[PDB]
A paper describes a structure:
The botulinum neurotoxins (BoNT) are among the most toxic molecules known to man and are responsible for botulism, a rare but potentially fatal paralytic disease. The binding (HC) and translocation domains (HN) combined to form the heavy chain (HC) which is linked by a single disulphide bridge to the light chain (LC) following cleavage of the toxin into its active di-chain form. BoNT/E recognises neurons via a dual receptor mechanism that involves binding of the HC domain to cell-surface gangliosides and the synaptic vesicle glycoprotein 2 (SV2). Ganglioside binding is common to all clostridial neurotoxins and consists of a pocket in the HC domain that holds a conserved SxWY motif.
Here, we determined the X-ray crystal structure of the binding domain of BoNT/E, a toxin of clinical interest, in complex with its [name] oligosaccharide receptor. Crystals containing HC/E in complex with the [name] carbohydrate were produced in space group P21, which diffracted to a resolution of 2.2 Å, with two HC/E molecules per asymmetric unit. The [name]-oligosaccharide fully occupied the receptor-binding pocket of both HC/E monomers, however weak electron density around the non-interacting Neu6Ac6 and Glc moieties means that they could not be included in the model accurately. The receptor-bound structure of HC/E reveals an overall ganglioside binding mechanism similar to other BoNTs with a central role for the conserved ganglioside binding site (GBS). Three of the five carbohydrate moieties within the [name] polysaccharide: N-acetylneuraminic acid [Neu6Ac5], galactose [Gal4], and N-acetylglucosamine [GalNAc3], interact directly with the GBS. More importantly, a significant conformational change is observed for loop 1228–1237 likely triggered by its direct interaction with the sialic acid head group (Neu6Ac5) of [name]. In particular, R1230 seems to take an important role in this loop movement, as its side chain repositions itself so that the guanidino group makes electrostatic interaction with Neu6Ac5, thus pushing the main chain and rest of the loop further away from the ganglioside. This interaction is also stabilized by water-mediated bridges with residues S1235 and G1237. Gal4 interacts with the central SxWY motif by a hydrogen bond with S1222, and is held in position by aromatic interactions with Y1225 and stacking against the indole ring of W1224.
Residue numbers in the entry:
A (entry chain BBB), B (entry chain AAA): 849 to 1252
The structure:
């Protein structure tokens, strides 16, 4: 375990599942993601806060004891102009009237951790991810934050399992944190919201191996992710990003094939995300028990989004003596006796075209300028890297990311 | 073998070893590193140039043929004041009077690649490493740069084998590079020098695999590296950095043990490097090569520098029940029948204390606030990370990095 606080959703509210049974209360309007109620949004244009009343005996008051904090945060930039201001605002507050304890704050494209003792001596850690230069891994995406505190060593800041910033806290004396942890946007100039999920406190300094274990497990790997790090959904319009060609987008040709030799236009240095064809994912075998979540090894149809309500199947043209099979839009609504098997490697999604007789056509990818299904990828994967042409992200249009 | 230009040192000059017999001319005062002549230094306070007259065959003049550039660069910041100006200056120029071709340029903590066609259309790739926040892997260090160009897709900038920037060059037409590659610091507003080594042009778009191979193999993998990325040397004074404890330095206690609970002071956010004890390395038995280069599996003595005259052996105190053996300074010059076996994982150095009888005492490391030899590390290594207590860098005091 090591966890002395596990914030999780149960029975239309948030509860502590660590065993220390800390009390969690919602005040005002707190958004719950319908598809993952572990995820909550907080606003600053209303009353909107989560207050954890910590178990009296977990409340950190010490000079020597090690502790760690982990959570995921989602920071929308909207138009990217509203956020472009040098001002620091608190999102998670665990500091007493003494100003002893810790807090998580934000700035323009920045996450900040502050730890301060009873004497007003502090240490601050920062991650500055900056503006989207091509494709951003951070803006409007779930970001896994982990702060580990060694009282005889340094405080270390991790982002998505990677060590970013570490500074000595050997100078820090007795730290007494607030009885309350307040999830609220305080002193933000503009109106916005922030996403929080899987907030944890641990009674030790986590090592890299334990941090990477939390990073992969907490999201639930069995369910595929969209671009933003949310659960991939059936019956939902998505743009396509090829992870090996982040500057390219998919367009329809007149012969009903798909081109990938289209360059994304830039807003400053940021690639446009809402470019090229939109697709919807559909279950092969429907039911009532079935939710809208896309899981590993689910058999689906990839539907091209046409003029309006109209949806045409994507299929691999197998009538060729060349190994790569051209992807075509079926005008007739014929599936050509094919299914697509969904799978993933982290946030990268794969689409394996198979005939209904169970034979492999190949993974969705590209050959020169054309989108194809190819078996080449099975034996030519590049390990522990996003530079594989069979890796795709699904981008849903959202108010959090504006290209208006 | 896709190399069409390979700049290496032979017979008191630089020559093309690719076999395409391009000419390399040294004009004026160009510094050659005595320990690695393949590395050269370029000044802007006087005449300092390397000029490659490319063989007419290798001169790039095409709109479809893929190509890659690779080289290491070393950029000192001195006392981090004179370099703090927004001023883009050229270091490598392959631009025709047409302003067609490519060039490498620098700004404050920045490396820039520019590619331009005959019609003035250009694309720029940038790497901004910024100021030292604790420890910098970039400032006054050998940085491996790799640019690959797909005329049907992206130009890609790699730093130390990692993809940093990629942008479409698909809209670029005929590119005609100049006949000459000029290594010279041009339009830098301040006086400085720049290190270069292992310049290559390739006649294809290298993949991540080939870039990773050049990164590890170009500098001799059998020779250990100092903090800057130069070869580690015998009979040379070094400060110590523990890689797991970058904010800490090693001092001597009055009892002759070594403390690691000493915190580096900062200039802005940059840790001091010239703190704590000085060590020198000495061969147990002299080398047949006639070198001062520290190699993998070399048996050495590590000597504490009390003063320039007075050197004292480091030994592991084996007169204890503890598994970890406290490192001590031998006042009497007694080495207690021990040697140190040097090895490396990339730029990380390991020091294995052993008895002359062949028994292992343990890798140099720490247990809480005390430097130790410990066999624990043998069976408790974390793979694919610098987060190991038995990983060390050796910092030589140099004018390129000032802390004054
Ligand atoms: C946790 C620890 O002390 N590990 C020792 C190891 O201890 C053994 C068991 O693992 C202990 O549980 C047990 O505890 C008993 C006490 O000894 C006893 O007094 C008490 O009465 O009862 C306890 C419960 O029974 O003791 C046994 C003894 O065998 O013993 C080994 C030797 O075999 C090591 O000493 C080990 O400590 C590690 O020592 C190495 C050097 O040998 C090194 O100093 C380690 O320190 C680092 C590291 O390099 O990995 C330093 C890092 O900063 C630190 N943190 C991070 C984030 O990396 C890591 C830790 O691994 C991390 O804090 C937790 O994963 O340690 C040092 O840990």
């Amino acid at each position: 375990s090591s966890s002395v606080l596990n914030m999780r959703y149960k029975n239309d509210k948030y509860v502590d599942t660590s065993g220390y049974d800390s009390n969690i209360n919602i005040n005002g309007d707190v958004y719950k993601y319908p598809t993952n109620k572990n995820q909550f949004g907080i606003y600053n244009d209303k009353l909107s806060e989560v207050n954890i009343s910590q178990n009296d005996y977990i409340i950190y008051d010490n000079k020597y004891k090690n502790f760690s904090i982990s959570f995921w945060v989602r920071i929308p930039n909207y138009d990217n102009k509203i956020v472009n201001v040098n001002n620091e605002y608190t999102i998670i507050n665990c500091m007493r009237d003494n100003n002893s304890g810790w807090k998580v704050s934000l700035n323009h494209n920045e996450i900040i951790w502050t730890l301060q003792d009873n004497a007003g001596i502090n240490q601050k850690l920062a991650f500055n991810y900056g503006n989207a230069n091509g494709i951003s891994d951070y803006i409007n995406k779930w970001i896994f934050v982990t702060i580990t505190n060694d009282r005889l060593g340094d405080s270390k800041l991790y982002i998505n399992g990677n060590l970013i910033d570490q500074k000595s806290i050997l100078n820090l004396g007795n730290i007494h944190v607030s009885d309350n942890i307040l999830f609220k946007i305080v002193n933000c100039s503009y109106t916005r919201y922030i996403g929080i999920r899987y907030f944890n406190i641990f009674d030790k300094e986590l090592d890299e191996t334990e941090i990477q274990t939390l990073y992969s497990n907490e999201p639930n790997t069995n369910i595929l992710k969209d671009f933003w790090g949310n659960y991939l959904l059936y019956d939902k319009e998505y743009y396509l990003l090829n992870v090996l060609k982040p500057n390219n987008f998919i367009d329809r040709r007149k012969d009903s094939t798909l081109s990938i030799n289209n360059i994304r236009s830039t807003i400053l240095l940021a690639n446009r995300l809402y470019s090229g064809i939109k697709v919807k994912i559909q279950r092969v075998n429907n039911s009532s028990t079935n939710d809208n979540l896309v899981r590993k090894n689910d058999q689906v149809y990839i539907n091209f989004v046409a003029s309006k309500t109209h949806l045409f199947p994507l299929y691999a043209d197998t009538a060729t003596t060349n190994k790569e099979k051209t992807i075509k839009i079926s005008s007739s609504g014929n599936r050509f006796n094919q299914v697509v098997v969904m799978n993933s490697v982290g946030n990268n999604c794969t689409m394996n075209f198979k005939n209904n007789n169970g034979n492999n056509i190949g993974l969705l990818g590209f050959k020169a300028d054309t989108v194809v299904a190819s078996t080449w990828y099975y034996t030519h994967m590049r390990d522990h890297t996003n530079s594989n042409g069979c890796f795709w992200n699904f981008i849903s249009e959202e108010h959090g990311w504006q290209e208006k």
